[PDB]
Amino acid sequence: NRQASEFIPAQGVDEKTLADAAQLASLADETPEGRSIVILAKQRFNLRERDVQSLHATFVPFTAQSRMSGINIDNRMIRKGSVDAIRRHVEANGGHFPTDVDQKVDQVARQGATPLVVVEGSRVLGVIALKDIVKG
Ligand SMILES: Nc1ncnc2c1ncn2[C@@H]1O[C@H](COP(=O)(O)OP(=O)(O)NP(=O)(O)O)[C@@H](O)[C@H]1O
To answer: Which residues form the signal peptide?
Structure first.
């Protein structure tokens, strides 16, 4: 019962950029929430999912244990998942989680939203605040 409502760029990132990466990196996840995000950009930008096999790219399945899904393509890599999840993905690449992005994820949470974090390759492009359909 979770849907993306808004995306916010990381330090120095454009908001359209964050929404776009969350959409294609969610095409590979089979979770209903990954569709919730692909909608978020749809209404905001009115765009369509990107075909991975038309780019000869690859989908990255979403697993709950790491809480992460993404997509790979012949010129880019995208990953999105839990804040702890994305921090571990950046460190494995050898990237770093910018404070500004950690602050956006926390304000997403303190506001009652579930902040997901999205990065390109090993760097965070922005964070996503989701509304919870069901209230705890
Ligand atoms: N399309 C998606 N791609 C990548 N991650 C997602 C996607 N949709 C949801 N997520 C994250 O994956 C989490 C769900 O996986 P899960 O491991 O069951 O977490 P959870 O235990 O239910 N939540 P929490 O208790 O806060 O860790 C969601 O809460 C989101 O933060």
So the answer is: none
